[PDB]
Paper text:
The femtomolar affinity of streptavidin/avidin for biotinylated targets, combined with resilience to harsh conditions and an on-rate of ~ 107 M− 1 s− 1, is the basis for biotin's central role as a specific biological “glue” in diverse research methods and biotechnologies. We previously generated streptavidin heterotetramers with exactly one, two, or three functional biotin-binding sites, through purifying tetramers containing defined numbers of non-biotin-binding “Dead” and His6-tagged wild-type subunits. However, tetramers with two functional and two Dead subunits can assemble in three different arrangements. To generate a controlled and stable bridge for bionanotechnology, we demonstrate here a method for the simple isolation of streptavidin variants with precise cis-divalent or 1,3 trans-divalent arrangements.
To understand interaction between ligand binding sites, we solved 1,3 trans-divalent streptavidin's crystal structure bound to biotin-4-fluorescein. Biotin-4-fluorescein represents the largest ligand where there is a crystal structure with streptavidin or avidin, as well as a widely used probe of the binding kinetics and capacity of biotin-binding proteins. Our 2.3-Å-resolution structure shows the 1,4 dimer in the asymmetric unit (one copy of SAe and one copy of D). Building the native streptavidin tetramer from this dimer shows that the two biotin-4-fluorescein molecules are in the expected trans arrangement. All the contacts of the 1,3 trans-divalent streptavidin with the biotin moiety are as expected. Fluorescein and the ethylene diamine spacer form several non-polar contacts to streptavidin not observed with biotin. Trp120 is 5 Å from fluorescein and may explain part of the quenching of fluorescence. Biotin-4-fluorescein bound in chain b reaches over and interacts with residues of chain d. However, we do not believe this conformation of biotin-4-fluorescein is the same as when four ligands are bound to the same tetramer: if the SAe:biotin-4-fluorescein complex were in a cis arrangement, there would be an obvious clash between the fluorescein moieties of neighboring ligands. Even with a ligand as small as biotin-4-fluorescein, our structure showed the interactions that would inhibit cis binding.
Residue numbers in the entry:
A (entry chain B), D (entry chain B): 16 to 133
B (entry chain A), C (entry chain A): 15 to 133
């Protein structure tokens, strides 16, 4: 299922628990960027997905602050769980750093992460 | 405190949110049409210790478009920053992903931008 | 005709463009500071036969940030639509990719939005 | 080099010619969506890239109109050429359809395409 420990192509670690209320909770450890150790995450997922083989929609957020470090930024991942012999979560993400109004144009990075339980 | 409250977008969407000292965002998102039928759980995070150099406050949240009235089999995430002022604002970009077949994954994700203003 | 002309964004960026009957966009993009040093080639495409139902006109263009004065080793693409009116507008979202190492590819692409208005 | 015939994970075909003026020209054939046969493309690329092993930045546009069909939309790809034993062009793209102002919120799809010469 969705619950468990996941890894992306960057080697970052995504540990998540999916509740029946549609809630996501857990921790995220980034391999790259201004991050150290684990950060809190929370999100949502569709608790009653379709049955036509479609994926299960979900999303979550990490604010890159912990007791170790503060990168003044947040990332949201938006994607879906796909079932199969090899289960994976495909996402696209938006990473926004706090900026002055003059610098807002360079506030937001975009990318794509594919997660697996390897 | 600054983030905590009710906010509205231009298209008519509203949300109410509470920002905890632990960096948690929790509340409810309501779509353009004002009814209970269009109220959904909102959950996210924020920088509880933003910089002091004039920068905005980074944040993000998620709404899965399922409630006790309906299920659209999708979710939206907003990633942006809070900008304080006499008229405070939250400037975001968002990603809406719907459940799809692997074959239709390429058309699974919409992207847009929303600016919210505080009541 | 409607697209053909000079356009300006809020941050001060301007571009001049010509729309050919073949669906080609060609012109020059100038960054916020008004000098020759900041003028770059613009190239793109557009729907020369848009729908008649009130929809906007789909378009897109690219600027590689290299000219005879400087090279930032990057490129931006704008994808949006033209909206005719007394005050015509082009509403876009854009992607700016810089050349990176495979290791830094994850931080290679910025995303944003710009609305241009016609002079 | 960049010039040549390329294919993405969707099986779509990307035939491109890179000029020394920084210009891109060619044709694109989509495997998916409201497309038939070939459509014109044009774009730009950095003609004098760095030497530190960094990729070469580029972008291009396709308006989904030809003599066969009109999908009232346009796609722009933004990414970079990466050199190696297996050369590829990694992109992210924005696909905007013409819409009413009320429907602009659902005007723009986003995704990622990886191209190779296979
Ligand atoms: O450090 C963090 C938190 C860790 C994020 C980990 C991510 S979340 C998604 C992904 N998945 C995962 O598991 N880990 C990563 N975030 C904030 C830091 N932001 C950047 O590193 C950043 C942002 C913007 C730029 C940036 C720029 C920064 C400043 C400037 O003046 C111009 C810039 O121009 C750019 C142009 C581009 O095409 C791309 C980026 C920039 C740069 C940079 O170039 O070093 C870096
Ligand atoms: O047909 C074309 C031209 C071919 C594009 C080929 C692409 S270019 C990038 C990629 N790479 C490549 O080689 N080929 C593809 N484009 C315009 C058509 N757009 C769509 O197919 C489209 C756009 C939006 C929606 C859409 C919606 C459409 C209508 C509506 O009322 C609500 C919609 O909600 C959505 C929610 C989502 O999360 C995702 C999509 C939608 C849908 C759909 O659901 O069928 C479909």
């Amino acid at each position: 299922g969705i619950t468990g420990t996941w890894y992306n192509q960057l080697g970052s670690t995504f540990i998540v628990t999916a509740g029946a209320d549609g809630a996501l909770t857990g921790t995220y450890e980034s391999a790259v960027g201004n991050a150290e150790s684990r950060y809190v995450l929370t999100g949502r997922y569709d608790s009653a997905p379709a049955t036509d083989g479609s994926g299960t929609a979900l999303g979550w957020t990490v604010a890159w602050k912990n007791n170790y470090r503060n990168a003044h930024s947040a990332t949201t991942w938006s994607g879906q769980y796909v079932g199969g012999a090899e289960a994976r979560i495909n996402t696209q993400w938006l990473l926004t750093s706090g900026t002055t109004e003059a610098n807002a144009w360079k506030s937001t990075l975009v990318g794509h992460d594919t997660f697996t339980k390897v």
